[PDB]
Design a protein around this nucleic acid. Sequence first.
RNA 1: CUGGUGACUAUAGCAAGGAGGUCACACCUGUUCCCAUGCCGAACACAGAAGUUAAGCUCCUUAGCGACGAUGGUAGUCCAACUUACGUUCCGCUAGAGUAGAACGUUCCAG
RNA 2: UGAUAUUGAAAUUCGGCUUUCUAACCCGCACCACUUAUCGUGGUGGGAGACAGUGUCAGGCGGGCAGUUUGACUGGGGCGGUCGCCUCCUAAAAGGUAACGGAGGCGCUCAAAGGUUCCCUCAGAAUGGUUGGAAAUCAUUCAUAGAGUGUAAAGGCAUAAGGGAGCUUGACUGCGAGACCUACAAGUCGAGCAGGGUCGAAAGACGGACUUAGUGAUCCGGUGGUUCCGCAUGGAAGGGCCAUCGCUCAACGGAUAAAAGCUACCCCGGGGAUAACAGGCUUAUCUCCCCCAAGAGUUCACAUCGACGGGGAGGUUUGGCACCUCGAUGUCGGCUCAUCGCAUCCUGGGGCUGUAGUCGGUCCCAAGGGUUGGGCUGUUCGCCCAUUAAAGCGGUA
RNA 3: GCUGGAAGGUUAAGAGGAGUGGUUAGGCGAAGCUACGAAUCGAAGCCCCAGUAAACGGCGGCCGUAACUAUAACGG
RNA 4: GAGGGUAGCGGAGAAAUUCCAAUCGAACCUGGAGAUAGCUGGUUCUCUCCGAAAUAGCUUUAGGGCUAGCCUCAAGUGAUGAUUAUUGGAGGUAGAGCACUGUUUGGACGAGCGAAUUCAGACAAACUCCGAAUGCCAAUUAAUUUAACUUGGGAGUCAGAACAUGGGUGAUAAGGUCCGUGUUCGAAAGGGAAACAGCCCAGACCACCAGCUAAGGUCCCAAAAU
RNA 5: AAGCAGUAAAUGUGGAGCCGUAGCGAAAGCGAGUCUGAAUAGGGCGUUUAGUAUUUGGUCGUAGACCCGAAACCAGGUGAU
Lengths: 47, 96, 78
Amino acid sequence: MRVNVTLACTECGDRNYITTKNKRNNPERVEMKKFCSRENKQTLHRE
Amino acid sequence: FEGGQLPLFRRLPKRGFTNINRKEYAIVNLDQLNKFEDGTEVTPALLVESGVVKNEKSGIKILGNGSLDKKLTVKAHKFSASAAEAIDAKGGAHEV
Amino acid sequence: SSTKNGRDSESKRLGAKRADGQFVTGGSILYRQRGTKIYPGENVGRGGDDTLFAKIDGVVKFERKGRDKKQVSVYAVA
RNA sequence: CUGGUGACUAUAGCAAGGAGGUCACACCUGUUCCCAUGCCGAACACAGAAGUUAAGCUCCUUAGCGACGAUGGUAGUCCAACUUACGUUCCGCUAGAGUAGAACGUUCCAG
RNA sequence: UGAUAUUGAAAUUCGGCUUUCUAACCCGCACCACUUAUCGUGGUGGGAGACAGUGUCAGGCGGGCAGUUUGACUGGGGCGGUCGCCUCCUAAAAGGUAACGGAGGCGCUCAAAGGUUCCCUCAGAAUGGUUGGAAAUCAUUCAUAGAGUGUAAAGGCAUAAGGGAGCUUGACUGCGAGACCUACAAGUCGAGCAGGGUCGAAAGACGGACUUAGUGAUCCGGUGGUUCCGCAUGGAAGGGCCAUCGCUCAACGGAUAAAAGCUACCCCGGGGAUAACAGGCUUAUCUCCCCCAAGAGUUCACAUCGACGGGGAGGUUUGGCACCUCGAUGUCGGCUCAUCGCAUCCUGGGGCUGUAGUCGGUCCCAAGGGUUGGGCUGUUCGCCCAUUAAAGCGGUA
RNA sequence: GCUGGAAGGUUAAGAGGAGUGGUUAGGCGAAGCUACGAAUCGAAGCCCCAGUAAACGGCGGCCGUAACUAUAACGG
RNA sequence: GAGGGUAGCGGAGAAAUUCCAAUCGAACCUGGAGAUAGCUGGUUCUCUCCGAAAUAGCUUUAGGGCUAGCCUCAAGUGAUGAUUAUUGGAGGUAGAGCACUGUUUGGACGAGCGAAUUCAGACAAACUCCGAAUGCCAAUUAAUUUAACUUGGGAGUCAGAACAUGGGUGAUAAGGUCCGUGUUCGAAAGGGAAACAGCCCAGACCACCAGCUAAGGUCCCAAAAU
RNA sequence: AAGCAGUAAAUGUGGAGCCGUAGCGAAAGCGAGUCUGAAUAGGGCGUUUAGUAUUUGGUCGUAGACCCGAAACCAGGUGAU
Ligand SMILES: O=C1C=CN(c2c(F)cc(N3C[C@H](CNc4ccon4)OC3=O)c(F)c2F)CC1
């Protein structure tokens, strides 16, 4: 039931991540605050 | 042959590529310039007939692995950042 | 006319790795275990999987810590 | 013969009975003031004339249950001889028993 | 079976399948000439006709024919079962260690079941109750953890790793002294430094989860980013590098993108490293003897019979093992000729009787000599007919 | 398996040339030349509709019950 | 009877895998050709020094191969090797025990009274409040000893056997089978066990009509006490 | 080295060519330093750095490759006395 998800930056340089996800428990795209290597600061992700 | 087990080269992956326009140079450190006369003019045409450079591949580049010990004027294609620092410190002047 | 058994997992090399009174370095493994059968002491850390390692250079010392409990420590050599 | 804070395998415990104080610990009467409860100003923290050793807490006594336990034997056992189960020489249990034991105690605050 | 070339006309017709006409092409059709032979060529009639036949391209059917594949372990081989990873016992108090030895589990899950700060503490509850086949809920004491800890087991955890309540995304980027493990490839732990941060008053903690299973080279292809290369030059097409994806490749170190059976018609190279017959070791099973005496036999354990349980001998049965023989040790039942053991079928000599006599039962000593002829089945066995003083049992490849 | 049939579904070359890229005369970019493309038209065959066994092949199980008292002519 | 026809990716067959020049499930001759063989057999003179393995991991792998482990020859670095005494530590086997999880004998006490109460007596590879003898890791500690390690050249080995001892398996059967530990054979002559690779004593450089011993022996065969 | 002159002598000529003196990186490139990285912060591989030509011995590779031996496969021919 779980799936692989990739997190990209929000309208800036893309420094992606990879995690897991449950479709039913979270039927919509998620958002988190991660590190952006290019920008050198915390930034919100999605997808 | 490993008797049936996968060979090491098959296990490992390939890497890199080759460039068709690869240019190489014949290096000559500041140590091989201690035989010419003081103030003489050194030119690739001379280094290939004096006995320092046996085969000039694509030009002569002068490096700085050592001291010059003389004041000369050198003519080459490329100079190391430290080769010209010590060539102009003992007198004279280099040129491309 | 068949067997239902016959399975087993690879053996892990658990136990102590250095002896008491021996000289070690800053990152030497001292004891591999499941859980905490021996507790860390002075200048000792517990790894993620309960592995005990030193943090400085000195002699190893296995001592008792309370009734029915053991620890391991490291003291700099003078 | 006190309070505070540490060191050590309960020989530091559990019980049972006794004694003691308003200088200190507690109990203690309040919820306007900061903060707190998935009923209880119950706990947490508080604002603080009195009321009292009944318990918390202590220094004193008692070996009842737990705890600590040599000496001497026994089982087992390394080595070496016989031979299969018996000799010899080092180590040395468990259990049980005579027994210890109702703590020892650094720095520290004021007496 | 379609498209197109060879291949040209006319009309019907809600860049066209179809009636339609001669001129290409076709006729083992007729009459003539070469030629008093009809193979062939040529000419004139007839038939057919832009079809057929022929070339290239495409789709389907195709053991008719061809090249090949069809695993290993295994108390012989088949059949059955098994193949990777995790935990425990066997394992002989370091680590490591086998069998088709004894027991289970895995091919995940969780956006809070993660990080941080402050709080808290469980089963079972000798009794009371709005009294519902004593155990839902509430109340007070016994309570050495007998509760829990996503999921097997074993080591750990009440200084909590177990429960609840607030804010959070460190389930971060670039690495990394030194160690464990180890044939290789892989796997495991890690102080500390720089860049960002979250929680806390602050020390300080944080590079997922109490710990250990939840996974698979490379080669090739896809999707993003980018310092780089890009055939004379400037671009491009294609490559390199970083991130990531797609395999019950489960025979799980994975032969290829793609694979099943029979041979009594059989062949070659090897093995007693490995079966069928005889020998050998073994004695479960088999055959034959003993111990105890509860009871059957009118009374009466012991004339004779012997439940429950126990101890031996023999090496004739069916097996276990795989030590000799696979550059070869020929089967079953007879026939012919015998030999030898005694656990004695007959003949000889003795006890005891539940022995009147005539006949028997059982047991001891005795191996000198004897121990039939036929019917039915290939037989051994076995049954039957008629006899005999008796129609004994075993060994010798 | 063979024979006949046609309503529809699916399906090759070939025909068809929307539209998207790489180049440049003058972040756009008309032409020319170039590397690739879709709507739609393309037959048999196979799914479908029938017929054929002196074609290949196949032709049941458990209960109770007499005027046939063991049995089961009958019924479930 | 004579003269003719059909030829091996083929002929012939009133059909048997039947025949095609004395062996046809696919004729004969020459060539590719010294096809290939992880399988058998064979492999030629002499001395000197040293001297194994029959194990692990992976394998379309199991009587084959590869790396590691044991052998040998050189060049190097220096007590880093081995045994013993002593002081330290880690680790739950033998035995023992019933405090936990089980299994289980005989009584006593009324909560429905032989195993979640009490008084006695037992049992366990997957039970432990306890717990050895040994072995193992250390201390540039002490004495006696002679190795050890690194780099490079060349190998062989991957079928093992019996005896003692701690275990599984089988039936507390096997000269059975699979692991731990030591010895011998393998590759080891000599003496003893009548004969007898694995048992006991003991390791052959050569020669001698010299002596002392081990295992085992001393009436005769037959050296030694009637 | 080929070639040229020499007795099939093995000498003289012949300097295209090969190895060494400098590494690091996939590459552009830089250079006693280079790669990774925002950062000589740390780490990896180098600065240890003698070489080269001929030849005896040992081993390996491509050729039948220490010797003898198949059951078979394909090609072109000879046979119905
Ligand atoms: O039903 C039976 C099954 C096989 N049996 C058999 C046999 F009868 C003889 C021998 N052998 C082998 C050896 C070589 N003999 C031969 C003969 C031909 O080839 N080799 O000599 C023998 O005795 C064998 F092993 C058996 F299993 C017994 C009878």
